[PDB]
Amino acid sequence: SESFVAAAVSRSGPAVVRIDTEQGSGFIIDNSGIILTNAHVVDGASKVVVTLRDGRTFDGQVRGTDEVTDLAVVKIEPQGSALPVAPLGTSSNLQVGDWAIAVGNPVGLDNTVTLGIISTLGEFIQTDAAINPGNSGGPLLNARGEVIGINTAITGIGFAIPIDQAKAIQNTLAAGGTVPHPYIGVQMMNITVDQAQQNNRNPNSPFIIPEVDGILVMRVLPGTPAERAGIRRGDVIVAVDGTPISDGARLQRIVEQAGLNKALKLDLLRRRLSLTVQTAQLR
């Protein structure tokens, strides 16, 4: 009698809450009052008001925030009748073209529902389910109604944090404390020989590029480990110690796998030159 959409909303929609600080959506993932949302919803504030789809309101505490993934965990006081819960799916099962249901609780008295598909996977989910404020921080449901992502506002193309990312961040955020995001601080670019010689053909390019294939430092962000290690705009990173490289993403993964406060040795041309960068926490 209902479509499958009406059904998925009937399964997970009750757990979708309104969040105000003086604004957006969240959803309860545990009968004890654990609530996921976006960090930009809760601001840097720590006191939050949670309104359930049924009208119950809760003084909820911001238990804290990952600015980088844009996730926050709120907790509320599970008094009275039991808090309803959204069942968590898994995002490593998404294919492009799978149905996507984005649910909000902007007002507090009703869900907002929009319908789309998974448009892209990276690790942001992309969907053409209309993703708008108020609806942001609410869940992205699959056809069965399992949370597979967290809507984020930021065309017809909207983004969701894949739910398995939140699953990894949940314990840490819910218990205060900082999710580690190690970085060194360079804007980088993969450099192609055709591209280095191309660049060098132009009398007005800013620097001569040493004709190789590597990682061109485009910018050294101020106050970063990379500035402190003496990296300059124009350096070409070629290998992280040992392993050669030409892929900005492979360097991303070596930095992350390294961890916080680890020296990395870097092979760069400028002249040949290796430096050590002490990873620090992205903020």
Binding site: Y183, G185, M218, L251
Partner: peptide, 4 residues
């Protein structure tokens, strides 16, 4: 253009 990526940030590491």
């Amino acid at each position: 253009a990526a940030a590491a």
